[PDB]
Amino acid sequence: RPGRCYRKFSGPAYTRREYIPGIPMPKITKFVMGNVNGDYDYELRLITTEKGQIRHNALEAARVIALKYLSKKLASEQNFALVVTKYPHHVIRENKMMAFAGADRLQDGMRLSFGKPIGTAARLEKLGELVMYVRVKKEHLEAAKEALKIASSKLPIRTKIEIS
Amino acid sequence: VARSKGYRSKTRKLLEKKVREKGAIPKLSLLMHDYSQGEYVVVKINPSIHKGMPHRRYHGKVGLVVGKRGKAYEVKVNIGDKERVLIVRPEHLIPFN
Amino acid sequence: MNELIGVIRIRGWAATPWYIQDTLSMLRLKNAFNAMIYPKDSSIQGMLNLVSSYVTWGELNDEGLRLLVSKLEISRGKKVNEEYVKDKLNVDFQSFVESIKDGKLRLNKLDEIFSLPIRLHPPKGGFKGKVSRPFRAGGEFGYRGDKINELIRRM
RNA sequence: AGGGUGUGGCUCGAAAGAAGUGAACCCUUCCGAAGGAAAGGGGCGCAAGCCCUUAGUACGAGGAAGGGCGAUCGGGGUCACG
RNA sequence: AGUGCCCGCAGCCUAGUUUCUAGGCGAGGGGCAGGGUCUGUCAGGGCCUGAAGCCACUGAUGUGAGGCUAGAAACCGGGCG
RNA sequence: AGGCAGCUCGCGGGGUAGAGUGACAGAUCGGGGGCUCCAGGCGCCUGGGGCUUCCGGUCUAACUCCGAACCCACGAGCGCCGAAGAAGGGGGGAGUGGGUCACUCGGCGUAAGGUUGGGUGGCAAAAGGGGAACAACCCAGACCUGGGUUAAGGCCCCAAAGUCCCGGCUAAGUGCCAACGAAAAGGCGUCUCCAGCCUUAGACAGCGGGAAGGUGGGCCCAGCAGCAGCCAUCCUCUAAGGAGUGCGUAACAGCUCACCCGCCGAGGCUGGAGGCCCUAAAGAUUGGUCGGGGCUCAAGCCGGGCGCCGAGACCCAGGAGGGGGUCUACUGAGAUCCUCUGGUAGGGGGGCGCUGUGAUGGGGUAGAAGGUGGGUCGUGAGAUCCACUGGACCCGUCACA
RNA sequence: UGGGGCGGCACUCCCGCGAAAAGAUAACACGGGAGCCCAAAGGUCGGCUCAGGCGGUACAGAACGCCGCCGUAGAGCGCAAGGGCAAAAGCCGGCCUGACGUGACCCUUCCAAGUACGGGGUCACGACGCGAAAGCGGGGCCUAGCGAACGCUCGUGCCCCCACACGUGGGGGCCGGGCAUGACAGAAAAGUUACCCCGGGGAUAACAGGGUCGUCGCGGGCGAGAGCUCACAUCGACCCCGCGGUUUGCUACAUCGAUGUCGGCUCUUCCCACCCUGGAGGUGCAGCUGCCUCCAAGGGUAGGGCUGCCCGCCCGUUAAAGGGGAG
RNA sequence: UGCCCACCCGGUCAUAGUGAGCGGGUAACACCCGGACUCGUUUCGAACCCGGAAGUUAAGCCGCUCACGUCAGAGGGGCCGUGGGAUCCGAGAGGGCCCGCAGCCUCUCUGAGCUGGGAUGG
């Protein structure tokens, strides 16, 4: 299903697991990469621009692409560390019934059209919220710029970078 | 989905009490003072006391002491353009102003 | 903050929200191009704030007040047994300030107490004299300081 | 396409409507609602204009008087164009 | 069973009418009453009781009769093929 | 004789927006310390498992230690209506129970001129002006005629008024579109603005030279003689140079890279954001546009500004009608004052016509009736009249059916 | 009832959420419950304080018991949820039956603004029970656990039974209780009609417009990977952002006193996301054959077999035998 | 005198709490003495109940100090809303702006028991 289907907000959040049975397992499993507690100098972060919800599926892909670019750069345990901030707390639900029941004269249409859990999203509620960030030294900010930027290529929403 | 018209329906925090005043009835000082006709009172339901609990529909309002029956009082309150009488024990009444 | 305040309505009486439609009615502003004077107070302040997006109000001056009053006509008078008489002289006062007023038998001495609805005239040269939309805050609807005096002088 | 509408053109107009005890048409004088000028003068603004004056004046919707002219107007039908 | 308290309109009277809720009288009316009745063992509770309807015309609406007008497949009786 | 659709003050109620999670309930990411068990390796170390503590972060319609704006109750005050037109009580008669859309805060659902909620507004039943036409968008509530001023909008021509002004930007007809019509990315294409770094102790660019050597050190390597696979590294040195960048080469060699000098005397360079514009950007319904015409130091856009046109809204003048507060009449007619003026379902007030009955100062008829055409009255409903035709019966008034 | 049927009960009552800090407030919205159970799980009085954790003691054990310390509820309170609760509503004992008779007012049901039940609250009269007492007790800590007329039956003290009275029996009435209707504000109730019929319905299904785009086709961004080295000659995984209204999903705004429904035949036209033909280029282009990009809609784009089609498979040529629209 | 100092009877219901340290008692308050009678311990005079009362400030009580908990004040930092209006910007989501209001968290510093009714003690 296309990413344009869940970009905006359709109703409130969706969080209580005990109230919402059967959540598909999110793609993301690891959230921290690199030698945390390692010595770093440049302190660049990532900032979003407009509101919305981001599917975990893209994020996990964004997680992988960032790692390989850095991994080939120097190493995976070297003087760098990647940490993604948000978590897919939000859950999306879709009326899939038009697929199976939508061809057998069952209760089709908007009949009983409550959504069904198929994916999760990391919710964004503040203008300019952190999504991920990376810590390096003085000598590798240039590689870190596009490293975030290439990840941002896959994000659904417009993003912003900074240097610190 | 129509909601049940339970006598305490939709009260998840209406009858919630701030933790600082839990337990049995503390404010004995309010009760001991006695009302007479023509007095003006404010209804503030105590969720703890199960006796003479007025319905939620008239909570936090202005009441008038019109008489006394038994240990309890009866109170006149205007809600719409009608009149109503609420017979209640005093332990949800606080003087106005 | 001075006691003598006034208001002019410029909007019509259709598409007027339930909140406000009766307020101007309660403010005796039945329809646009009308005015009257009030003693300023917090109690009055509420209406003007709530009716700001429909009228213009501010503090009068002597020049405006004298000009404003001079307009009472055959059907625009004091509550002198209704009739909205044309004041036109102390004469109408002389025989009829002895009801609610005391000591105001001079046309000049109306600077204290009360009045009735008055039917205004369109502002000369266009209410859009320099404006085009009647709905800018700080320029169009509501409070305009002394400038209301020149605005009514155009009237 | 149609009708009402303004200006006209051409047509019927015996009575039934006005009208020679004055129609229609010209002037002249007067009153005047709200509203509302301009030339000139002076000043200001790069300019676009405004400000006081000229002035609520000339003007004006409406209404009054006189005169001169002298018999059709009102009305019906069609058509031109707005 | 059909009375007894009070507020109080119009009108009236009073002097001022200063111009008049200044006060009385106060029909009507309103509120507390009371009474008759059944029921409740008392409070109570239900109902009735403060002296005016009938008749006639027209009118309107409801109800029942075809029921503003028109509109069906239907079913039944008796005959005729 | 008070009433309350608003506001203010005073005095109360609240768990929503938000915020927090070591304040519960859960969700959820990591590190540090200590304790414990296992596996491996040489009592130790490593990895894994469980426990604790500390530190950090990520969410909650069904979490709330807190918590607004806000909305509501009551009293007082303000304000308005009120004995011309009246809080409460009773009574006759209804239609109305399929709404829709716009805006705004929701839910469902991606979505929908979808559905389903809260509040407001039309529309329905609301004309008149603009938006090109238009139920709903804005202005604004049509007793009538006339005059004037104005609104929303617009002002080159169609079509009323600005080829109106200042400053700046756009080259695509981008555009000339409120309700409606293009995303991410790319653009130093252009137009303005923040950083940072070198610049007259000569900046960038540009033009020639020195641009180097023990040494092409080199390790394994025929040779890699920087640049075959790992990598160090000193002075001959100084206004200059690396044990050295990309081309390269089997291996070279060589051209360059890095640095100074010679001229050079104005800025130059790198991250940043924005406006407009280009690509992205492709559908025919049959045929080309902003309404067209047409427009390019604009008839576009942005910042602003200045002046006008524009309706039935408002002012005025004249007439009309309703409602409400004085006079005459064997029962309707006058004067004066105030005021009110869109319109279906519905209620109510009053008026003309048709045919008959009773009457009826009454009357009318061989010159009626009716028809045709045309005057005049009346808002109208209609009335009433004149020429002719017709050839024998017909109206006015009141009441009644 | 987002046509109807199938589906399910959103049809009876209750908890929270929905629901936007007054009230009320929709969904075939979400997460859930009830058609009971308790003579004690009830009333009162009295006594003790829980879950859990720490230290020491034979069996002894993390957890049977015992002695100390901490433990603000993290336990427990019958049943779902919410709330409430610590000398208690919790736990343990004593005595009891008020889970009382009769007659009331009031809240919710059922806002403002009408109303059956049911539940609940506050009473008086009378007698009880508990405790010394104040006092507390007409059920369960509070919020779900339920049924009109008519008829039948039960208890109650009388009342009435005839056009004459009286006697006996037998009947009838009250007032309250039970016997039920879950479609739960209460008819006694199985299927087909494609032989159907009738009045209607665009308030509404099917084909056919409009909206939309899950799907479909296409485009673009980015670039793990393959290509000998080299991401971008060509392929591009994971993702992201856009277009078209060609099918296909929903929408019911229009059409039910008819817009006559698939295909095909003939015939006209359009569009470009170009199949070929023209122009230009790149290429892992010796040349041919290739592969790919861009511009370009002027023209052309067949003939057969199987299948009714569409689709699909295939035959032999051709430049290929492009794809879509126009109800 | 006195008034506060504790006490009994309280109201406020944590700014009043908890924990530790120290100080105060010949009265008051407890600790503490003993149980035959009252009553009473599903053992016990533990506790309760009764009779008491030597000692004693160690408990408690009380005051003070320090910590934490906790109310406020200020400072720093965190975070950020909402009514009212427009043919305003933006396709939308969203945002600015004029008219009215704010509060939220977290660190630093500074305070942190008040009070009615009666018999002892100063």
* CA-to-CA separations, C112 to A83, C35, C65, C88, C108, in angstroms, rounded: 74, 16, 12, 20, 11
> Which nucleotides of strand D lie under 7 Å from a protein CB?
34-36
Instruction: State CA B53 to chain mean position distance.
Output: 7
Is B12 in a helix, a strand, or coil?
Answer: coil
> Residue for token digits 């621009």?
A49
**A120: part of which helix (H) or strand (E)?**
strand A116-124
CB-CB neighbours of B90 under 10 Å = 20
Residue type, C131: V
**Neighbors of chain C with 3 or more C-beta pairs under 8 Å:** none
Determine the angle formed by the axes of helices A141-153 and A56-73, rounding to 10 degrees: 150
Helix/strand/coil percentages in chain C, nearest 5 = 25, 15, 60
> Residue B1: CB partners within 8 Å, gap ≥ 6?
none
Rounded-to-integer distance, Cα C150 and Cα C68, Å: 11
Q: In 3D, which of C78, C54, C56 has the Cα closest to residue C145?
A: C56
Instruction: Using the structure, give the distance in angstroms from the CA atom of C26 to the C1' atom of F81, rounded to a whole number.
Output: 9
Q: Which two tokens stand for residue A18?
A: 């005990």
Alpha helices by DSSP H, listed for chain B, are: 28-32
User: What resolution in angstroms does the PDB record give?
Assistant: 4.9
Q: Is the CB of B27 under 7 A from strand G?
A: no
| Pairing of β A130-135 and β A32-34 | unpaired
Beta strands in A30-103 (DSSP E): 32-34, 45-48, 52-55, 81-84, 90-94
What distance, in Å, lies between the first and last C-alpha atoms of chain B? 42
Name the CA radius of gyration of chain A, rounded: 19
Protein-nucleic contacts, chain C 76-135 to strand D, CB < 7 Å: 121, 124-125
Q: Is the CB of A98 under 7 A from strand G?
A: yes
Alpha helices by DSSP H, listed for A41-140, are: 56-73, 97-100
